[PDB]
């Protein structure tokens, strides 16, 4: 199985996927706000998606999405993630975070394939935690656009919706899971999701996740189960504010990390 080689196109999927979606970005505000990175051996920022090699599947999906110039967050975060460096990014929803992490993560899954374990109940290769159904679904739809013609099947699960059908959807295959934290703990307790092969971990809107009381659930998913530890998994944490509790989560969860600040 070559994971770097596009699967055949489907007109209906292209129609469902590449018409009628939004980037979740405010380019007016955020193109003109500078980004700063600090840390050891910080990879240099890019000016174009072409400046790193994200491979055939992403470059075609980029053309179908009609994405052009990256936002400043994307210019700094994409090379960092592409180097497999952990990241703490103080960056707002609307600055361009989602693609900043999804493009290089998916790119790396494509050129590395699933791994020997999967090449041999669901064990996602990538996990993204989000505080809310709305952001979880935003991210899931972006993942769907950039996994078009790939073996990666994204899924999303959230609370306040029925666990039964989410289970039934997982059972159809899941390589990248977007989840709100309490719903994932339920799925783990029911034996539906395994974290043994999760090599890419993203916490989005981490400050809101903590404020809504999810820190116990997050520590259980990340620290007290089978998720590979830092230095093995690659971890990215995004937050619009940087209070003491986020700095603690950063220090606990990230390894030798670059810090990115918008403004």
């Amino acid at each position: 199985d070559d994971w770097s080689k596009p699967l055949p196109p489907s007109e209906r999927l292209e129609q469902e996927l590449f018409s009628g979606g939004n980037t979740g970005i405010n380019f007016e505000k955020y193109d003109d706000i500078p980004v700063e990175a600090t840390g050891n051996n910080c990879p240099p920022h890019i000016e174009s998606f072409s400046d790193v090699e994200m491979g055939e599947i992403i470059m075609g999906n980029i053309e179908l999405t009609r994405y052009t110039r990256p936002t400043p967050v994307q210019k700094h975060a994409i090379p960092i993630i592409k180097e497999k460096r952990d990241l703490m990014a103080c960056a707002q929803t609307g600055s361009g975070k989602t693609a900043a992490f999804l493009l290089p993560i998916l790119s790396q899954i494509y050129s590395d394939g699933p791994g020997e374990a999967l090449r041999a109940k669901q064990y996602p290769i990538s996990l993204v935690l989000a505080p809310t159904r709305e952001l979880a679904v935003q991210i899931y739809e972006e993942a769907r656009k950039f996994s078009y013609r790939s073996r990666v099947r994204p899924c999303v699960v959230y609370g306040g919706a029925d666990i039964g059908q989410q289970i039934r959807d997982l059972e159809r295959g899941c390589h990248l899971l977007v989840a709100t934290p309490g719903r994932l703990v339920d799925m783990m307790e029911r034996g539906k999701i395994g974290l043994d092969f999760c090599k890419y971990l993203v916490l989005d809107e981490a400050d809101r996740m903590l404020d809504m009381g999810f820190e116990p659930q997050i520590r259980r998913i990340v620290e007290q189960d089978t998720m590979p530890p830092k230095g093995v998994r690659h971890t990215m944490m995004f937050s619009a504010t940087f209070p003491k509790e986020i700095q603690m989560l950063a220090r606990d969860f990230l390894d030798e990390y670059i810090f990115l600040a918008v403004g």
Binding site: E116, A117, G194, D196, T226
Partner: protein, 154 residues
């Protein structure tokens, strides 16, 4: 005794071991078994470089060197001991809280050979021939069996 089998690719074993050691309490006594194809020096010296107090045994060294390493270990001055199976023959491991199989052996009998509170074993494709035997054993000890380990025994 808690037996935990984790999937760890070769290129991730060192970083996984660092995390297993960073969680050790006051660094209780930990024994790390490595394949002779890697050698105990490679792991001991990496741990030292990374700032860890540790030591090693080998089967070809002087009894003086062995006993100095074993005393550093036993007394808690170097609470991590790296060893191959051959080097650890005759070793009294009754004071070891944590055994880490950095490399698993070829056969389940050697695994059975190795105050013990926890045995963590690293597993990847190189260990496929021992999947069912390791499976059967974990059932006997009423131990957690990872789903992926059964699906690999298949």
């Amino acid at each position: 005794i808690t037996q935990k089998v984790v999937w760890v690719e070769e290129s991730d074993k060192r970083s996984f071991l660092l995390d297993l050691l960073n969680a050790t309490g006051k660094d209780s006594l930990t024994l790390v078994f490595v394949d002779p194809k890697k050698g105990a020096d490679s792991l001991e010296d990496f741990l030292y470089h990374e700032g860890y107090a540790c030591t090693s045994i080998h089967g070809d060294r002087s009894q003086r060197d062995r006993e100095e390493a074993l005393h550093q270990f036993r007394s808690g001055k170097s609470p991590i001991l790296v060893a191959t199976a051959v080097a650890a023959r005759g070793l009294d491991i009754s004071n070891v809280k944590h055994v880490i199989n950095f490399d698993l052996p070829s056969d389940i009998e050697e695994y059975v050979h190795r105050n013990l509170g926890l045995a963590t074993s690293f597993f990847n494709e190189r260990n496929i021939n021992i999947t069912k035997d390791l499976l059967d054993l974990l059932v006997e000890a009423k131990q957690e069996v990872p789903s992926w380990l059964e699906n690999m025994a298949y």
